[PDB]
């Protein structure tokens, strides 16, 4: 379906290039922000302010087709129920980077 084509665009992720890969989360703001107080793990980059959600979450992987091309960005929409990993920073202690989904 077209969910990804729309989302990437309305969230300005297709402005000056086509962001190849992007994950969206279909949970409450409160639920996502809560991960910041869940399972502390290492970030992909070596830092240690990342957290893995205790629960899987309803997400959606957006990945540009091999045939896509700016300014006509095109994505395959893939839905999933998976644990997310985010880097939390600041006060309030909230997500500032999406690290991974497992």
């Amino acid at each position: 379906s077209n969910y990804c084509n729309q989302m990437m665009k309305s969230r300005n992720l297709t402005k000056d290039r086509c962001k190849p890969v992007n994950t969206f989360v279909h949970e409450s703001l409160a639920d996502v922000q809560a991960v910041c107080s869940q399972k502390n793990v290492a970030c992909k980059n070596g830092q240690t302010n990342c957290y893995q959600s205790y629960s899987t979450m309803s997400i959606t992987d957006c990945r540009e087709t091999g045939s896509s091309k700016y300014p006509n960005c095109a994505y395959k929409t893939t839905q999933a129920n998976k644990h997310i990993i985010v880097a939390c920073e600041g006060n309030p202690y909230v997500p500032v980077h999406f690290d991974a989904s497992v």
């Binding site: 989360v25 909230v94 500032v96 999406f98």
Partner: peptide, 14 residues
């Protein structure tokens, strides 16, 4: 734009 605000624009679809 803040890092937090960017996270939402990019990954938040509640």
């Amino acid at each position: 734009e803040t890092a937090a605000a960017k996270f939402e624009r990019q990954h938040m679809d509640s």
